[PDB]
Amino acid sequence: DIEADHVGFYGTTVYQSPGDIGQYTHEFDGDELFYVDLDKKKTVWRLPEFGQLILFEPQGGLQNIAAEKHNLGILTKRSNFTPATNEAPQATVFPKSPVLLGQPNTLICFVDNIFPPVINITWLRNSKSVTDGVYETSFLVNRDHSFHKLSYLTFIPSDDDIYDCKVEHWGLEEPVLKHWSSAD
Amino acid sequence: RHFVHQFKGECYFTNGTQRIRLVTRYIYNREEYLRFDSDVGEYRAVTELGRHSAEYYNKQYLERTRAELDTACRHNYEETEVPTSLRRLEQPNVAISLSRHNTLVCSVTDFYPAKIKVRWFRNGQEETVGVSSTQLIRNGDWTFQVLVMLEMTPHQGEVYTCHVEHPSLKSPITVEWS
Amino acid sequence: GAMKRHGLDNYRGYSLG
């Protein structure tokens, strides 16, 4: 890897078929700047603060996405039609701040080694699902050309409850729940 | 079957602007095949897939790409990163705990950037033994965190200190425990 | 006159059709 004070990741584009699944992001020092909601065609920032002052124009990347739909078709053929190799994801659950009972916290679920970039991360408390408080970052890039996502979940520290982070992929024959509890 | 194509435009800045390097990788599936390297100065195939491609891109696109370094890297840094990302400074959440020879887990959470220093003290004396630590934890919400243990046995009356140094703090943080 | 953000372009390779 190249050593340096800072690293920009402008232009990071990614396209796949079938399904017309594409993505465009910008990173700085490995922290996602924003992505671009292709359907609404809007520059969706990661953090509010940033996209107030200076701005990014959604078309800059709605175009990249178009070039990558084209480039794909070229290589797909030029490589005798070589499909991608599914790799298995590695989950790592953990609290965002010092866990104290009955104090609003956040439960991060970091998933790594993804490819194809198509993942179904879902949270689960006490063997029954959860849907409230769950944010989820776009696919951030790796140096090895795979990806890592994170699924956040706010909660209240209880030793009664058991959290699992359910991860579903094609490179998995069946889902992978990484268990977590304040008990241990 | 599933097929993928990526593209990464990386801009490396060292000593601020005084040294910039620009890589650019066109990647089928997981296999990088073409690549612009500002150091090299031109496009270079990297697998047999983008063998005749380098000729093309060099033919068609080489000129503009070479300036993308000063027109996209240089610019973004000076004009959009300097006043936003580099400006961001977060103060940490120092909080000493106690294991489940006991252990003084001293958490330090939610900060930015990643530059920091987390020393331990025993009655005003620095300790390097027993003291474990973790690898800088990237939260993703533009904040960090790290847990700095300290295996010890506690005599009544003894004072401890988690000493944290960060750019967001003029005066180093200290947290004590009896 | 608020400066904005640029974003490295990715180019098409020869196709024919």
């Epitope: 800059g60 070039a67 | - | 904005k4």
Partner: T-cell receptor, first 112, second 109 residues
């Protein structure tokens, strides 16, 4: 290569003028500009994927349309007086320039 | 004002030289110099990404960082009349082409 038509047109105020364009360069981008009283050409619509039009700087009162890859039509539904100008069609691939190639102008004139 | 063409129009005689300034507001990816003849047709003279180029009696330069681009014509001829345009690429707001306000060149005999 890029060829427009009509190469010139005269229209009543309140009529539908429909400028067509057609290129044989297999270029993905196409543009429609307009040239007013010697002060430059100004983008109105572009398009970089069949059946996708994208607004330009002064897209007010025009409707573009990219049916196939070779064709890109500009449409005024209610010809105005202020829409008298010369409309240039240019194309390209990939991102301009060095491979953008312009049309030949289309003098439009609108009378009451 | 994104692009700025100067002068707005100029006079000249045979053989004599002159230059044309083009100052921008932000950093533009590539510039492109044109010239609209008497017919009304746009003819590309230069496409620059950086530095300078030269073509016979013509020569141009481009500096993204210092936000400007010049066009120096040496040994003016008659055929050299007609207006002149520099377009610049945006990259920031889409990558539009932003043309200047033309510069009517008149080459006296």
């Amino acid at each position: 290569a890029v060829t427009q038509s009509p190469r010139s047109k005269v229209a009543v105020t309140g009529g539908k003028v429909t400028l067509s364009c057609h290129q044989t360069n297999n270029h993905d981008y196409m543009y429609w500009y307009r040239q007013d009283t010697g002060h430059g050409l100004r983008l109105i619509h572009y398009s970089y994927v069949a059946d996708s039009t994208e607004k330009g700087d002064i897209p007010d009162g025009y409707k573009a349309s990219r049916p196939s890859q070779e064709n890109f039509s500009l449409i005024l539904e209610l010809a105005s007086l202020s829409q008298t100008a010369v409309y240039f069609c240019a194309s390209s691939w990939d991102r301009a320039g060095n491979t953008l190639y312009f049309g030949e102008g289309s003098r439009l004139i609108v009378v009451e | 004002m994104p692009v700025e063409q100067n002068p707005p129009a100029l006079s000249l005689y045979e053989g004599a030289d002159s230059g044309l300034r083009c100052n921008f507001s932000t950093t533009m990816k590539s510039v492109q110099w044109f010239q609209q003849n008497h017919r009304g047709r746009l003819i590309t003279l230069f496409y620059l990404a950086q530095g300078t180029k030269e073509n016979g009696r013509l020569k141009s330069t481009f500096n993204s960082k210092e936000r400007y681009s010049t066009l120096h014509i040496k040994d003016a001829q008659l055929e050299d009349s007609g207006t002149y345009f520099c377009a610049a690429e945006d990259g920031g707001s889409g990558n539009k082409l932003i043309f200047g306000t033309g510069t009517l060149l008149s080459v006296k005999p």
